[PDB]
Amino acid sequence: SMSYDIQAWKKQCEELLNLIFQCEDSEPFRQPVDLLEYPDYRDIIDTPMDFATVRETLEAGNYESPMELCKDVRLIFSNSKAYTPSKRSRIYSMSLRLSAFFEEHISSVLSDYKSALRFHKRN
Ligand SMILES: CC(=O)N(C)Cc1c(Cl)cccc1Cl
Numbered sequence: 001s002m003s004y005d006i007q008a009w010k011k012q013c014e015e016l017l018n019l020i021f022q023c024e025d026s027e028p029f030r031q032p033v034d035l036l037e038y039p040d041y042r043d044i045i046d047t048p049m050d051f052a053t054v055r056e057t058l059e060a061g062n063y064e065s066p067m068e069l070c071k072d073v074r075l076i077f078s079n080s081k082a083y084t085p086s087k088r089s090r091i092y093s094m095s096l097r098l099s100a101f102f103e104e105h106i107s108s109v110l111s112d113y114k115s116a117l118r119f120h121k122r123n
């Protein structure tokens with residue numbers, strides 16, 4: 001059980017999403033972009049992603065690892081940077097701030113999970 005528990009990431013990711021949903025900085029990123037309201041978004045962005053879609057994919061069991069979750073979250077940020085590339089835009093700055101908060105908190109989740117995989121493979 002608890003040392004090197006390979007399923008502990010899931011709850012840790014739930015908690016981290018909870019903190020993201022509280023952040024004012026996530027507000028633009030909580031819901032899918034209204035694709036029928038914002039017409040050229042698909043002209044620019046190949047794979048839209050947002051935090052509600054991530055939270056559901058996790059709840060539904062459709063992430064195999066926290067690295068798969070982290071890939072989707074990074075896509076949220078790389079999509080913002082592509083759609084709102086100006087350092088002057090307040091949306092750009094929100095995305096930047098929230099991305100750095102995310103990468104700080106996910107860091108231990110990934111390392112712990114990889115350390116666990118290692119242990120179990122070894123033994
Ligand atoms: C997630 C994202 O790309 N946002 C919120 C930028 C944005 C704004 Cl500020 C206003 C209208 C449409 C869009 Cl699409």
Ligand SMILES: [Mg+2]
Pocket residue numbers: 062
């Ligand atoms: Mg899959």
